[PDB]
C-alpha cells in the first residue's frame, strides 16, 4: 500500500484558471495564512509563570540522588557495590569498612554528579532501596567542588525529606 | 518453545544456502567460505584480490541486484596473520535478502578501494583509513575524518588505550590551547567479568 | 606483483605514534591467567593475556582517588597461542617476559582407593 | 495590592487551599488548565533573606513540593502525621552562593600510617 | 472556555477550524492521579509442576554456523529470496 | 552527637577527623564542614529487642518490597542476641 | 612474505619521494608562517621540520617509508589549506614546558620513575 | 613534612608537589602568571582578593579539580591575613598600586602591608617567604616608588631576616604596562640607559627560588642581558609597531637608570635560560592595522 503525491495536470477550465489568476493577483491564500495567524493570536497562551506556577512532573522522576534510612533506624545501605557494578559512567565510588560493631557498612560513598547520567540502574540494582533517585532538581552551583557528593552530604540530603521519597516509592513499588 | 523462543525459518534458510552454494560454484577464483547462521543471513568470506570483481558481480548478473551498501568495517582482531576484516553488508531492492561480504587483510597490504562501483563507500573508506590504517589504493582523497587534525594513531585499535596519549587544556602564558600527557582524575576501575563453568558447551574448539 | 621478501621484523612502532617512554620502558608480561582458586573451573584459561607493568597511582588531593599518569595500565590483549604473541610483540615494538602454561597433572583417585584393608587411607567419618 | 502587582502578575486569589509554616501560601484551582491548578505565594523574610524580592525555588517544604509538581491530588493537610523521628525540621534551604555551603572531603581514615620516630634520643 | 462570544466568533471567522471544540487547554480530561494501585500479574510461566528450564532454553540452542564451499545441464539459478510482487495503490485518496 | 577534636571542630562518625597540620583544614576556610549529627550507632541503643516465642524467626523490615529480603535468624544461644545482617536490630526468645 | 608494494619497488623511489616531501616542506614554511601570524622565525620552523625528518632514521621497509610520505603529504594538504590552525602548528612546537628530565639523579629525586 | 604533602607522579594536573602556596596580590599581572605556572606545577594556591570576583573567576580554569581557593582581606585588618596564613608551606608578597587612590597613598602600603603579613608569616613558622622589590630601590631622591620599596626591603629584612627578596628589572610580557605606555602615543628628546627582563624567565626563577634551597637570606636579581639605550629601544618599538590614572613618577622611572650590582647572583647562577626581547616584542607589539 503506497499513496504517492504531487501528480496533477492543472485543470484548464475557465473557472479554474480565473480562480487561480485571482489567487495570483490578490495573494488570496496568503491572506488565509494571515487569518490563521489571527486565529492563534486571539487564543490564550499555555505558559507557566516560573517560580509561582511550577510545571508538572511524574512519580518516577529522577533527581537529587538521596539516601533512605530505616523506619526508626540506621543507614539502609550495606555497601554491596551493585550500584558501582551497574553504574555505567563509574560515578559510584564505594570503599567499605565494617563499623565499630561488626556489621558491614561503608566509609567512602561517592556519587560523582558531574558523571551521573540519571538512568536508575542504581535504583534497580539496590537490593534494599537504599540509594533512591531524588525528586527535585536544584544543584545549580557556582562552584565545581559542591557538585561531587559524599556520605554525610547524601545523608543530610536524605534527612531533608523522607516522606517525599516514601510517597513516591509507595506509588511506584508495584511497577518497578 | 512455542512461546519465548524465537522461531527459525526453513525455506529462506534453504534458499540462502542454495544461493551461497550458487555463488561459490560460479566464482571458483575468490571463494574460501560461505556460511549461514541460525538467523539466516548469508555470509561470504573472501581472499583480498577480487574485491571489485565480487562487488561488480554482486551488483549485477540480474539474479542478484544488491544495490544497497553498508558499513565496510575492517573489524580488528589480534592473534592472526591477517588482523583486519573488511565487512561489506549488502541489501537488495527487488529481493529482500541480506548478504555479508567479509574479506580479510593485514596491517599494510592495501585493497583496491571499491568506491568506483559504490559511490557510498567514499566517506566510509576515508573514515576507516583514519581509524584503522587499511590503506586504499586507487582512491581520490584520503583525508582524516572523526579525528583531530594534529592527532594520529588510528585510535580504534586494541593498542591505543581507552584514554588517549593526548590531553588538551588552556594556558594564558601563550594565550592558547596546549597538549599534555594525559592525567586522569579517576582510575577507571576495570571489572573482571569472565565467568567459569562453560558458558556455552556447543562452541567448544578442539583443545590443544 | 611477487615483490621481494626479506628476513625482517615489522616496524609499526613509529607508525602508531605512541610516545617514546611508553614505547621502550613498558616491559610487557605475557601470562596465562590461571584458575581463580576461590572459584572452581578452568573456563577462564586458554587465553594468553598480554598485559603491561603497573606504575604509580597517587592520592587525588580532593577525594583520595587513584589518579594515574598511565595510558597503558588498563590494556589486556587476548591471544590464543604463544608464537603469535611473540610475533605481535616483535611487530609492535616492545619487550616482554613470558610465563609458561602449567596444566593440572592428573592423579589416580578412587573411592575404592579411599577404602582399604591394609593401606593407611582412612576417612573414618563417612 | 502592590505586593502582588509587583510580585509577578496575578490577581487570582479565590480558591484558598491553605498555607504552611514559613507562612507560604498554596492555592489549588480547577477552573484553569492543567499547569495552573496549584500556585504558590512566597512570603517575606522566611529565613531572614528578604525573600519578597529575589525569590528562590525550594523555599517550599517538601510535602508541598510533591503536591505542587502535580504528583498527587490532595494537599498534605489531608494526611498530617508520620511516625518517623530523624528528619530536619529547620529546612536549610537552597544555599549555593553563600559562605555556608557544601565542601567535599573523603570520609576515609589514614591509609599507610608512617613509622613513628622515637621520643627519646640516643648518644 | 472563559471567553467572550465575540472573540469566539472572530476565531471561527478567521478559519473554519471550530477552535472552541479542541483548544489546547487540558482541563479535566487527565485521569485523576493517585488511583487505587493496580496489580501486575505474570503470564506464560510461574505455574508449578511443568515449567522446566530444560524445555524453553532457547539461549542454549544457538547453533554453530553451517558451512558450504571453502578452501577446505543444470536447470538452476534461484534467487536468494522470492521476488516480492509490486505493491497496491492507496484506497483512501492517492494521487491519482 | 559531635565530639571535640583539638581543632575545636566537629569530628566525623568514622575516624577521618583532621590532624592539626592538615591544609585541607585551610581549604575548609569560611564554609560549613557539613556533618549529619544523627549517627547510626546512636539509634541501636534505644531499640527494644523483642521477645518472639519461636526458635528460628523471620525478618522483612515492615512489608515486602519496602525493606530487605527475608532473612532468617536463630535464637539458640542465650548469651548472644540474634542480630540481623540487614535490619541491624536484634531478637530474643522466651520460654 | 612476497608483499604487495605501495609506491616504490626498492629504496630508490622511497628516498626520492621523501626528498620531494622535504623539498615541499622547505618551500612550504614561509607562506604558512607569514599567513598564520606566528611568533617564531622561519629558520626555527625549518629546523623543526628537518628535526622531525631526523627522528625517523631507523625506518627501513619501503611500505613504511611510503606510508610516512603519505602521512606527510596528507599533513601538507591540511596545512596548505587552513583546515588546521595556529594551535596545531604550535602543537608541533613544544614550547610550554614540560622540562621533564632525563638524568638518573633527577629521575631519582623527582622519582617513582625509571 | 606531613603525609600527602610529599610529591607524586609526573608533573602537572594532580601532581601534589611539596609546596602549598599562598600568594598575595595576583589579581594583576605578575601574580596571575605566577599562579599560571603554579597550576602548571599542580599545587594548591590560596589567594585572597578584595576586588570584584571577575579576575578570580578568570584564574579559576588554571588549577586542577578544586585545587585553588579564594578568600578576602583588606589593608585594615589582621584576622583575615592570619586566616590566609593559617597553614601555608610557601608564601609570596606581591603588592602595590602604581597611582594614588583617595585612601591608599604610595606611603603606608609598602610600610604597613609587608610588616603585618611578614610578621604573621614568621609567627606562622613558614619557610621561604618571598617578597618582590623593584631594581635600584634607593633612599636617593626623585623616586617615591623606589624609596617606599626600599623601606619595604628594610622592614622585610628587619622582621624575619632570612626572607627571599627578589629584584628584577622592568618586565616585558603579554600585558605589560611600561611598554604599553611606550606604545601609547598620539615630540620629546631625552636619553637614559635601560635594560628589561622577560616575564616567564622571571617566574621560572621565582619557582626555582621557591623550591630550591640555599636561596634564603641573600636577595636575588633577575635582569635580561640587553644593556642598551632608551632611544634605540624607542626606535625598535616603533619600527616593530610601524608608526612614525597616570603620573610623572612613570617618566621618572623610565628616565632613572638600569645599573648592575655584582654582589648578588642572577640568572645563570640560579640556572634558567635568559631570552632576549625580539620575538616576545613581536608578540606584544600588536594593534597595528594591516602590516602583519
Ligand atoms: N620589574 C619589577 O620589578 C616591577 C615589579 N613590580 C611589582 O610586581 C607586582 C606586579 O606588578 P604590576 O603589574 O605593576 O602590578 P599588578 O597590577 O600586577 O599587581 C598589584 C597588586 O597589588 C594589589 N593591591 C595594591 N594595593 C592594594 C590594596 N590597598 N589592597 C589590596 N590589594 C592591593 C592589587 O589588587 P587589585 O588589582 O585587586 O586592586 C594587585 O593584585 C607588584 O607587586 C609590583 O610592586 C611592579 C612594577 C615593576
Ligand atoms: S546497591 Fe544499594 S545497598 Fe548496594 S552498595 Fe549501592 S547503595 Fe549500598
Ligand atoms: S543514575 Fe546511572 S549514572 Fe547516576 S549513579 Fe545511578 S547508575 Fe550511576
Ligand atoms: Zn532483617
Description:
- The PDB classes it as electron transport.
- The entry lists the keywords supercomplex, cellular respiration, mitochondria, electron transport.
- The entry is titled "Ovine respiratory supercomplex I+III2 closed class".
- Chain A is ndufs8.
- The structure is cut from a larger assembly and holds 8 protein chains of 8 kinds.
- By secondary structure, chain C is of the alpha+beta class.
- Chain C has helices at 20-24, 83-92, 111-114; strands at residues 28-31, 48-51, 58-59, 66-67, 77-79, 96-98.
- In chain C, strands 5-2-1-6 form a 4-stranded mixed beta sheet, covered by helices on one side.
- Chain D has 2 helices and 3 strands; from the N terminus they run H-E-E-E-H.
- Chain D has helices at 2-5, 62-68; strands at 18-19, 25-28, 38-41.
- The longest helix of chain D has 7 residues, at 62-68.
- The A-B interface holds A 84-85, 90, 93, 112 and B 186, 188-189, 191.
- Strand 1 of chain B pairs antiparallel with strand 1 of chain E.
- Bound molecules: NADPH dihydro-nicotinamide-adenine-dinucleotide phosphate, iron/sulfur cluster (SF4) (2 copies) and zinc ion (ZN).
- Residues 77-83, 94, 125-126, 128, 130-131 of chain A line the site of one iron/sulfur cluster.
Structural class of chain B: alpha+beta
Rg measurement of chain E, Å = 32 Å
Number of strands of chain E: 1
Cα(first) to Cα(last) distance of chain B is 36 Å
The H/E string of chain B reads HEEHEEHEE
PDB class: electron transport
Keywords: supercomplex, cellular respiration, mitochondria, electron transport
Entry title: Ovine respiratory supercomplex I+III2 closed class.
Chain A: ndufs8
Which short descriptors sum up this protein?
part of a larger assembly, 8 chains, A: 176 residues, alpha+beta, Alpha-Beta Plaits, 31% helix, elongated, B: 208 residues, four-stranded mixed β-sheet, two-stranded antiparallel sheet, 3 helices, 16% helix, binds NADPH dihydro-nicotinamide-adenine-dinucleotide phosphate, binds iron/sulfur cluster, binds zinc ion, electron transport, supercomplex
Question: What's the topology here?
Answer:
This is part of a larger assembly, with eight protein chains of eight kinds.
Chain B: H1 11-26, E1 33-36, E2 42-46, H2 51-57, E3 85-91, E4 98-104, H3 121-131, E5 167-171, E6 176-180
Chain E: H1 5-14, E1 66-68
Chain F: H1 41-44, E1 50-51, E2 56-59, E3 71-74, E4 82-83, E5 90-92
Parallel strand pairs in F: 1-5
Antiparallel strand pairs in F: 2-3, 4-5
The complex binds NADPH dihydro-nicotinamide-adenine-dinucleotide phosphate, iron/sulfur cluster (2 copies) and zinc ion (ZN).
Briefly summarize what is shown.
It is classed as electron transport. The structure is cut from a larger assembly and holds eight protein chains of eight kinds. With 208 residues, chain B is of the alpha+beta class.
Amino acid at each position: 500500500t503506497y499513496k504517492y503525491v504531487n501528480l496533477r495536470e492543472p485543470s484548464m477550465d475557465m473557472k479554474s484558471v480565473t480562480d487561480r489568476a485571482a489567487q495570483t493577483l490578490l495573494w488570496t491564500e496568503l491572506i488565509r495564512g494571515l487569518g490563521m495567524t489571527l486565529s492563534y493570536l486571539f487564543r490564550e497562551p499555555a505558559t507557566i509563570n516560573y517560580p509561582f506556577e511550577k510545571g508538572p512532573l511524574s512519580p518516577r522522576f529522577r533527581g537529587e540522588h538521596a539516601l533512605r534510612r530505616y523506619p526508626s533506624g540506621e543507614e539502609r545501605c550495606i555497601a554491596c557495590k551493585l550500584c558501582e557494578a551497574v553504574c555505567p559512567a563509574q560515578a559510584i565510588t564505594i570503599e567499605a569498612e565494617p563499623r565499630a560493631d561488626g556489621s558491614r557498612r561503608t566509609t567512602r560513598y561517592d556519587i560523582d554528579m558531574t558523571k551521573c547520567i540519571y538512568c536508575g540502574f542504581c535504583q534497580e540494582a539496590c537490593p534494599v532501596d537504599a540509594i533512591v533517585e531524588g525528586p527535585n532538581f536544584e544543584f545549580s552551583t557556582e562552584t565545581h567542588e559542591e557538585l561531587l557528593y559524599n556520605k554525610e552530604k547524601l545523608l543530610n540530603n536524605g534527612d531533608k525529606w523522607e516522606a517525599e521519597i516514601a510517597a513516591n516509592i509507595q506509588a511506584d513499588y508495584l511497577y518497578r | 518453545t512455542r512461546p519465548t523462543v524465537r522461531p527459525r525459518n526453513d525455506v529462506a534458510h534453504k534458499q540462502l544456502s542454495a544461493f551461497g552454494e550458487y555463488v561459490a560454484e560460479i566464482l571458483p577464483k575468490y571463494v574460501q567460505q560461505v556460511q549461514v547462521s541460525c538467523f539466516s543471513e548469508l555470509e561470504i568470506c573472501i581472499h583480498p584480490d577480487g574485491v571489485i570483481p565480487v562487488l561488480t558481480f554482486l551488483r549485477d548478473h540480474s539474479n542478484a541486484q544488491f544495490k544497497s551498501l553498508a558499513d565496510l568495517t575492517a573489524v580488528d582482531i589480534p592473534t592472526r596473520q591477517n588482523r583486519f576484516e573488511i565487512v561489506y553488508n549488502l541489501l537488495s531492492l527487488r529481493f529482500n535478502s541480506r548478504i555479508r561480504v567479509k574479506t580479510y587483510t593485514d596491517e599494510l597490504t592495501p585493497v583496491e578501494s571499491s568506491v568506483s562501483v559504490y559511490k557510498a563507500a567514499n566517506w566510509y573508506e576515508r573514515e576507516i583509513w583514519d581509524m584503522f590504517g587499511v590503506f586504499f589504493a586507487n582512491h581520490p582523497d584520503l583525508r582524516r575524518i572523526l579525528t583531530d587534525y594534529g592527532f594520529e594513531g588510528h585510535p580504534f585499535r586494541k593498542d591505543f588505550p581507552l584514554s588517549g596519549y593526548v590531553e588538551l587544556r588552556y594556558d594564558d602564558e601563550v594565550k592558547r590551547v596546549v597538549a599534555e600527557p594525559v592525567e586522569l582524575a579517576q582510575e577507571f576501575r576495570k571489572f573482571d567479568l569472565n565467568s567459569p563453568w562453560e558458558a556455552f558447551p556447543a562452541y567448544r574448539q578442539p583443545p590443544e | 606483483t611477487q615483490l621481494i621478501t626479506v628476513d625482517e621484523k615489522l616496524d609499526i612502532t613509529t607508525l602508531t605514534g605512541v610516545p617514546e617512554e611508553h614505547i621502550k620502558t613498558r616491559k610487557a608480561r605475557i601470562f596465562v591467567p590461571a584458575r581463580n582458586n576461590m572459584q572452581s573451573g578452568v573456563n577462564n584459561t586458554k587465553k594468553w593475556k598480554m598485559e603491561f607493568d603497573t606504575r604509580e597511582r597517587w592520592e587525588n588531593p580532593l577525594m583520595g582517588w587513584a589518579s594515574t599518569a598511565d595510558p597503558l595500565s588498563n590494556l589486556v590483549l587476548t591471544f590464543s597461542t604463544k608464537e603469535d604473541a611473540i610475533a605481535f610483540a616483535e611487530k609492535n615494538g616492545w619487550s616482554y617476559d613470558v610465563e609458561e602454561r602449567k596444566v593440572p597433572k592428573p592423579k589416580s583417585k578412587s573411592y575404592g582407593a579411599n577404602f582399604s584393608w591394609n593401606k593407611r587411607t582412612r576417612v573414618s567419618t563417612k | 495590592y502592590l505586593r502582588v502587582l509587583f510580585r509577578a502578575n496575578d490577581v487570582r486569589v479565590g480558591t484558598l487551599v491553605g498555607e504552611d509554616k514559613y507562612g507560604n501560601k498554596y492555592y489549588e484551582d480547577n477552573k484553569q488548565f492543567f499547569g495552573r491548578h496549584r500556585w504558590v505565594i512566597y512570603t517575606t523574610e522566611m529565613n531572614g533573606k528578604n525573600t519578597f524580592w529575589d525569590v528562590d525555588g525550594s523555599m517550599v517544604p517538601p510535602e508541598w513540593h510533591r503536591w505542587l509538581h502535580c504528583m498527587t491530588d490532595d494537599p498534605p493537610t489531608v494526611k498530617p502525621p508520620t511516625a518517623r523521628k530523624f528528619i530536619w525540621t529547620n529546612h536549610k534551604f537552597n544555599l549555593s552562593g553563600t559562605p555556608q555551603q557544601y565542601v567535599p572531603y573523603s570520609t576515609t581514615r589514614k591509609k599507610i600510617q608512617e613509622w613513628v620516630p622515637p621520643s627519646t634520643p640516643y648518644k | 472556555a472563559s471567553a467572550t462570544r465575540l472573540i469566539q466568533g472572530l476565531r471561527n471567522w478567521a478559519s473554519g477550524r471550530d477552535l472552541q471544540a479542541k483548544l489546547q487547554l487540558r482541563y479535566q480530561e487527565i485521569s485523576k492521579r493517585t488511583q487505587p494501585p493496580p496489580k501486575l500479574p505474570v503470564g506464560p510461566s510461574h505455574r508449578l509442576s511443568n515449567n522446566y528450564y530444560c524445555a524453553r532454553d532457547g539461549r542454549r540452542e544457538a547453533m554453530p554456523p553451517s558451512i558450504v564451499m571453502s578452501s577446505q545441464s543444470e536447470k538452476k539459478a534461484v534467487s536468494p529470496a522470492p521476488p516480492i510482487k509490486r505493491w497496491e495503490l492507496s484506497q483512501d485518496e492517492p494521487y491519482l | 552527637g559531635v565530639r571535640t577534636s583539638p581543632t575545636g571542630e566537629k569530628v566525623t562518625h568514622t575516624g577521618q577527623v583532621y590532624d592539626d597540620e592538615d591544609y585541607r583544614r585551610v581549604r575548609f576556610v569560611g564554609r560549613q564542614k557539613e556533618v549529619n549529627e544523627n549517627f547510626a550507632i546512636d539509634l541501636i541503643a534505644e531499640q527494644p529487642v523483642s521477645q518472639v516465642g519461636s526458635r528460628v524467626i523471620s525478618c522483612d523490615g515492615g512489608g515486602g518490597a519496602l525493606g530487605h529480603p527475608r532473612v532468617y535468624i536463630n535464637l539458640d544461644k542465650e548469651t548472644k542476641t540474634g542480630t540481623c545482617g540487614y535490619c541491624g536490630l536484634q531478637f530474643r526468645q522466651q520460654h | 612474505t612476497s608483499v604487495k608494494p605501495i609506491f616504490s619497488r626498492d629504496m630508490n623511489e622511497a628516498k626520492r619521494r621523501v626528498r620531494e616531501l622535504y623539498r615541499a616542506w622547505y618551500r612550504e614554511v614561509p607562506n604558512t608562517v607569514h599567513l598564520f601570524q606566528l611568533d617564531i622565525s622561519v629558520k626555527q620552523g625549518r629546523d623543526k621540520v628537518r628535526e622531525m625528518f631526523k627522528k625517523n632514521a631507523h625506518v627501513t621497509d619501503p611500505r613504511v617509508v611510503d606510508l610516512l610520505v603519505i602521512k606527510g603529504k596528507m599533513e601538507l594538504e591540511e596545512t596548505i589549506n587552513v583546515w588546521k590552525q595556529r594551535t596545531h602548528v604550535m602543537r608541533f612546537f613544544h614550547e610550554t614546558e614540560a622540562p621533564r628530565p632525563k638524568d638518573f639523579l633527577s629521575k631519582f629525586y623527582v622519582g617513582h620513575d625509571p | 613534612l606531613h603525609h600527602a604533602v610529599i610529591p607524586h607522579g609526573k608533573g602537572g594536573r594532580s601532581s601534589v608537589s611539596g609546596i602549598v602556596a599562598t600568594v598575595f596580590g595576583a589579581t594583576g599581572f605578575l601574580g596571575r602568571y605566577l599562579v599560571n605556572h603554579l597550576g602548571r606545577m599542580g599545587s594548591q594556591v590560596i589567594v585572597p582578593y578584595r576586588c570584584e570576583p571577575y579576575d578570580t573567576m578568570h584564574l579559576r580554569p588554571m588549577g586542577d579539580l578544586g585545587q585553588i581557593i579564594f578568600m578576602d582581606w583588606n589593608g585594615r585588618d589582621k584576622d583575615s591575613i592570619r586566616r590566609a596564613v593559617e597553614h601555608s608551606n610557601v608564601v609570596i608578597n606581591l603588592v602595590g598600586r602604581e597611582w594614588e587612590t583617595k585612601n591608599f597613598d604610595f606611603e603606608d602600603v609598602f610600610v604597613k602591608i609587608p610588616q603585618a603579613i611578614a610578621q604573621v608569616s614568621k609567627e606562622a613558622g613558614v619557610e621561604k617567604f618571598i617578597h618582590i622589590s623593584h631594581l635600584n630601590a634607593d633612599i636617593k631622591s626623585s623616586s617615591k616608588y623606589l624609596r617606599n620599596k626600599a623601606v619595604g626591603e628594610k622592614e622585610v629584612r628587619e622582621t624575619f631576616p632570612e626572607a627571599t627578596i627578589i629584584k628584577p628589572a622592568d618586565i616585558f610580557g603579554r600585558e605589560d604596562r611600561f611598554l604599553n605606555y611606550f606604545a601609547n602615543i598620539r615630540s620629546l628628546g631625552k636619553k637614559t640607559v635601560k635594560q628589561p627582563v622577560y616575564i616567564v624567565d622571571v617566574t621560572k626563577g621565582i619557582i626555582n627560588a621557591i623550591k630550591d634551597p640555599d636561596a634564603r637570606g641573600k636577595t636575588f636579581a633577575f635582569v635580561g642581558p640587553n644593556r642598551y639605550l632608551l632611544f634605540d629601544l624607542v626606535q625598535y618599538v616603533f619600527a616593530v609597531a610601524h608608526r612614525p590614572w597616570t603620573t610623572r613618577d612613570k617618566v621618572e622611572r623610565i628616565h632613572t637608570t638600569d645599573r648592575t650590582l655584582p654582589h648578588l647572583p642572577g640568572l645563570e647562577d640560579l640556572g634558567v635560560q635568559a631570552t632576549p626581547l625580539e620575538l616576545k616584542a613581536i608578540e606584544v607589539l600588536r594593534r597595528h592595522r594591516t602590516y602583519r
